């Protein structure tokens, strides 16, 4: 007994867009499925002169185990009556070939210290989320002061998604 329904969690109320951008290093991530970035994640979010907010992301996967390779990305995130969710089109521009439409909500933040990005792409009957992905988001790659860990630790629980969340290696690898 713990509402799990996405349809209700809370976002970051008046999301400054601009306020968000520059660089954030991803610090742990929750997986969806399939493909996804592994490791050395870093992303850098912007927003040109009428308000569209974009980012880029940058990190490495690994192909079958064969391969290390540097992907590199862009998105485009259209906006929503909640300013905190977005529509974001994103796409490969390296190697990578591939484009996606994913949901994009920032649940909280603070700007300067830290942040928690997520993405439901599939919804149960029931209304919970079938396959999610989630990025803990640090201004400083050493690390969030002792708030911003509380706050986060707050919402991994309300977003049903705490303990499914690994640490990210960040070695200058890309
Ligand atoms: O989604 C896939 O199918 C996939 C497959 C193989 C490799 C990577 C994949 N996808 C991702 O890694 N991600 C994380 C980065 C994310 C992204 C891209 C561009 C700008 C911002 C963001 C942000 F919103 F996540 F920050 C897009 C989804």
Same mark, same amino acid.
């Given at each position: 007994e713990r509402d799990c329904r996405v349809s209700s969690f809370r976002? %970051?109320? *008046?999301?400054? %867009?601009?306020?968000?951008?520059?660089?954030?290093? &991803? +610090? !742990?991530? %929750?997986?969806? @499925? =399939? #493909?996804?970035?592994?490791?050395?994640?870093?992303? @850098?979010?912007?927003?040109? @002169?009428?308000?569209? +907010?974009? !980012? /880029? !992301?940058?990190?490495?996967?690994? #192909? #079958? *185990? *064969?391969?290390?390779?540097? &992907?590199?990305?862009? =998105? /485009?995130? /259209?906006? /929503? @009556?909640?300013? &905190?969710?977005? %529509? +974001?089109?994103?796409? =490969?521009? &390296?190697?990578? #070939?591939?484009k996606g439409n994913d949901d994009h909500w920032i649940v909280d933040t603070d700007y300067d210290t830290y942040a928690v990005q997520y993405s439901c792409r599939l919804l149960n009957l029931d209304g919970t989320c079938a396959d999610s992905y989630s990025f803990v988001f640090s201004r400083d790659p050493n690390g969030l002061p002792p708030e911003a860990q509380k706050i986060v630790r707050q919402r991994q629980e309300e977003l049903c998604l705490a303990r499914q969340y690994r640490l990210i290696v960040h070695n200058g690898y890309c």
């Open positions: 976002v %970051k109320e *008046n999301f400054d %867009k601009a306020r968000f951008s520059g660089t954030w290093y &991803a +610090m !742990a991530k %929750k997986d969806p @499925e =399939g #493909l996804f970035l592994q490791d050395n994640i870093v992303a @850098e979010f912007s927003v040109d @002169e009428t308000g569209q +907010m974009s !980012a /880029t !992301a940058k990190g490495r996967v690994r #192909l #079958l *185990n *064969n391969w290390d390779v540097c &992907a590199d990305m862009v =998105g /485009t995130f /259209t906006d /929503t @009556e909640d300013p &905190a969710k977005f %529509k +974001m089109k994103y796409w =490969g521009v &390296a190697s990578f #070939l591939q």
